[PDB]
Structure 1
Amino acid sequence: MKFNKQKSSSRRKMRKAHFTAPAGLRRKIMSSKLSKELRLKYKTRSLPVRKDDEVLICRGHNHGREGKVVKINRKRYKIYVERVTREKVNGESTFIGIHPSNVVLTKLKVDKNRKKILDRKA
């Protein structure tokens, strides 16, 4: 690392650890940034992205569009938004994969689990 010699800074090792991470670690890696308004109401800076949140697309060809998150794909490292779509060569409709770090989430969907986390973070 920087000063403690007990963990690595090898490209090989922790580039192998990113692509074979277990499914319980993949949700911490898949985290987004909180808006300015949500950063006063909550003392956290960033949260892992969940399903029924609302996000603003900030980077890419679809920058500036908003909408709701309809699916999370932990194997491919991607999320899906409700009206951002594509046509295949057949003519069937699909969803364009978005990377969660390209996004900032503007409205949350709280529950029993979330509260006991935001409370600790504040």
Structure 2
Amino acid sequence: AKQSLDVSSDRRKARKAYFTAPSSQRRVLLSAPLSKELRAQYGIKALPIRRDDEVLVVRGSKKGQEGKISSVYRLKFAVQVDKVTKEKVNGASVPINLHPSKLVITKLHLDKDRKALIQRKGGKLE
């Protein structure tokens, strides 16, 4: 259990801190786990999802589908995959909204910084 005096087990406080979290904080909550491949590749279990990454839906009814993240919708706590959409009745397609904890990262998108993140978590990077 919590041993620190600055942690709060309070449920009402957690749920406030989630929904009222600023854009910067949602970035890290919106982490997705690396694929078993990419994990032993990079020596790292999970990373905050970013836009042009590549991803496989491992949960839900889009289970098995893959694509490129078209946008991180931080406001909505949802990530959108280009290639995963609803065809509507009038035929106009519309994005589905996915949660990064139900995705898996199959290809990263690397930066000077995106690399340094992997290095700051203590893992190899091919």
- Alignment partners' CA distance in 1, 2:62 and 2:11: 32
Q: Which residues of 2 match residues 25-36 of structure 1 at below 5 A? A: 25-36=25-36
Which piece of structure 1 moves more, 79-88 or 24-33?
79-88
What's the counterpart of residue 77 of structure 1? 77
1:87 deviation in Å?
Answer: 3.2
Q: Secondary structure of 2:63's partner?
A: coil
Q: Which residues of 2 match residues 11-30 of structure 1 at below 5 A? A: 11-30=11-30
1:78 deviation in Å?
Answer: 0.8
Q: Which residues of 2 match residues 32-111 of structure 1 at below 5 A? A: 32-111=32-111
AA matched with 2:22: P
- Alignment partners' CA distance in 1, 2:90 and 2:41: 47
- Alignment partners' CA distance in 2, 1:88 and 1:40: 40
- Alignment partners' CA distance in 1, 2:9 and 2:35: 32
1:90 deviation in Å?
Answer: 4.2
- Structure 2 regions of 5+ residues with no counterpart? none
* RMSD of Structure 2 on Structure 1 (CA): 1.4
- Alignment partners' CA distance in 2, 1:35 and 1:60: 17
- Alignment partners' CA distance in 2, 1:42 and 1:86: 34
Structure 1 runs, 4 residues or longer, greater than 4 Å off: none
Aligned length: 122
Q: Secondary structure of 2:16's partner?
A: helix
- Alignment partners' CA distance in 2, 1:29 and 1:67: 21
- Alignment partners' CA distance in 1, 2:44 and 2:85: 32
Q: Secondary structure of 1:24's partner?
A: helix
Q: Secondary structure of 1:37's partner?
A: helix
